[PDB]
Ligand binder design. Structure first.
Ligand SMILES: Nc1ncnc2c1ncn2[C@@H]1O[C@H](COP(=O)(O)OP(=O)(O)OC[C@H]2O[C@@H](O)[C@H](O)[C@@H]2O)[C@@H](O)[C@H]1O
Length: 150
């Protein structure tokens, strides 16, 4: 028991639990397409709670970009993958969007980011490749990543 929240010296922390139960200082990230369809997978809850869908289209983000919304004091990262859900995202393009997250996080002082198992749903990706890539991109950052796995 320690009052300071220490990470265990890791990039991706695997925890089973609901992702929406995360703190206000801890930001959410997930992947979606350019068409932005939340009506599939975990994306549904983010649309409902954070009201991201229109705002994302309002900002106009396309493949290789990230759309972020400040909501409840935390950030919400929408990694824009490819045009639609029927399209398989590439890891390189996903990497592009991952880079944008780290750049934003460090800039604002966001040292806490949680995400679900991205690259494991309609995205059709292999987590072994996805996770390792995230683990490389964020390898040298003060960003505490925790994946909520259901
Ligand atoms: N509220 C939740 N909290 C924690 N975990 C959850 C929650 N809801 C679902 N999960 C679990 O974590 C994972 C949710 O992430 P995914 O949607 O499966 O993976 P992701 O990369 O985010 O999917 C995005 C892809 O599908 C479309 O939304 C979009 O087109 C994009 O390409 C799933 O395995 C699910 O079981």
């Amino acid at each position: 028991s320690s009052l300071n929240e220490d990470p265990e010296g890791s990039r991706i922390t695997y925890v089973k639990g609901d992702l929406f139960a995360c703190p206000k200082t801890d930001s959410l990230a997930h992947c979606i397409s350019e068409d932005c369809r939340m009506g599939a997978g975990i994306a549904v809850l983010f649309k409902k709670k954070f009201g991201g869908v229109q705002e994302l289209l309002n900002q106009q983000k396309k493949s290789g970009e990230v759309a972020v919304l400040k909501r409840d004091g935390r950030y919400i990262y929408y990694l824009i993958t490819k045009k639609r859900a029927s399209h398989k995202p590439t890891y390189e393009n996903l990497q592009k969007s991952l880079e944008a997250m780290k750049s934003h996080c460090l800039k604002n002082g966001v040292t806490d980011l949680s995400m679900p198992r991205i690259g494991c749903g309609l995205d059709r990706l292999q987590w072994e490749n996805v996770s390792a890539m995230i683990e490389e991109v964020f390898e040298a950052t003060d960003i505490k990543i925790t994946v909520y796995t259901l």
